[PDB]
Design a binder for this molecule. Structure first.
Ligand SMILES: NCCCC(O)(P(=O)(O)O)P(=O)(O)O
Ligand SMILES: [Mg+2]
Ligand SMILES: [Mg+2]
Ligand SMILES: [Mg+2]
Length: 322
């Protein structure tokens, strides 16, 4: 173990969806149906169960019913399969050209007909997209497809950095995980689980800031938990602890300690944003009682996502949690 986990700022206790065991059973079955287990070259069933994405989603989406949790869990099974698949098939061989082609096919499985799927990533996305889109607005649809594409562009950017040996500097790292990282995608599914953000406030600064603080915080937390795997097994350079470490030339523990202080700070700004800036713009735009409740449902969702996410990271076999 390369460093000891720091003292985390954890103000709000996590809650756990009672449909957890339902989500587990369904998603493991769905994974095999998509071809993500034996024969994938990526996961065996034992891997998927040890990662425990049912537990992740039950922690991060505590209030939705059994069917919603099952769909969300499949989404996360898919997003992590895509991550480990891309690593195993393209990153470890630094196959930038084949990676590009792989990624270029995936938008064909998010129509705003579809081709036949040739791999589990394509198969999973096709399935999820058809199951999810009918329940949401046409506007959520366009935003969610964009968010999913950003995730895809992220893998490319990361691979190119690995291939050229270039670690991003601290501002570059943050801005890149903001622009193409998976926080808007996660927040996209929080809306599915809670309510879509009223368009009257969706593009305003306080909701933008709310997303910035949410994004920074979730990535920095994961960086702390996955540094060991990423640095001494994967060769992944997209990690905040590694970014500070190379920039300052400090010890691993020193960088993790500062990363965590940055994390606590982002969490502070989230709380302030959620409590003050967002309610203010809700008044300024004259949202109805119903619209205000949707906003509150969503921001509350982000809070529970973060608290649950930490409890998951402390348990999943993906991470440095002893
Ligand atoms: N799509 C899921 C993202 C997975 C990660 O969180 P992990 O540390 O678990 O590998 P990332 O690769 O972004 O660091
Ligand atoms: Mg990744
Ligand atoms: Mg990863
Ligand atoms: Mg990580």
């Amino acid at each position: 173990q390369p460093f000891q986990l720091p003292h985390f700022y954890l103000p709000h206790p996590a809650r756990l969806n009672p449909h957890l065991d339902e989500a587990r059973a369904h998603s493991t079955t769905w994974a095999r149906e998509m071809g993500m287990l034996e024969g994938s070259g990526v996961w065996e069933q034992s891997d998927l169960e040890a990662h425990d994405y049912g537990l992740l989603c039950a922690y991060t989406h505590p209030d939705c019913d059994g069917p919603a949790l099952s769909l969300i869990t499949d989404w996360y099974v898919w997003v992590f399969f895509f991550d480990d698949h891309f690593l195993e098939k393209y990153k470890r061989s630094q196959d930038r050209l084949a990676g590009k082609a792989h990624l270029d096919r995936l938008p064909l499985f998010m129509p705003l007909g579809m081709p036949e799927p040739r791999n589990p990533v394509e198969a999973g996305l096709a399935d999820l997209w058809t199951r999810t889109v009918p329940a949401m607005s046409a506007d959520w649809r366009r935003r969610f497809a964009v968010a999913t594409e950003h995730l895809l562009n992220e893998s490319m950017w990361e691979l190119s950095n690995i291939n050229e040996g270039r670690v991003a500097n601290p501002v570059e790292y943050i801005e890149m995980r903001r622009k193409v990282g998976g926080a808007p995608w996660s927040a996209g599914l929080v809306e599915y689980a809670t309510a879509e953000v009223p368009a009257a406030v969706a593009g305003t600064r306080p909701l933008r800031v709310l997303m910035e603080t949410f994004s920074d915080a979730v990535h920095l937390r994961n960086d702390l938990f996955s540094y060991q795997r990423e640095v001494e097994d994967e060769g992944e350079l997209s990690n905040g602890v590694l970014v500070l470490e190379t920039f300052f030339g400090c010890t691993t523990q020193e960088a993790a300690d500062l990363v965590n202080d940055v994390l606590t700070s982002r969490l502070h700004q989230f709380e302030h944003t959620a409590f003050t800036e967002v309610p203010a713009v809700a008044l300024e735009k004259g949202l109805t009682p119903l619209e205000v409740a949707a906003v509150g449902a969503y921001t509350k969702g982000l809070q529970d996502w973060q608290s649950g996410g930490h409890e998951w990271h402390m348990r999943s076999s993906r991470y440095m949690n002893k």
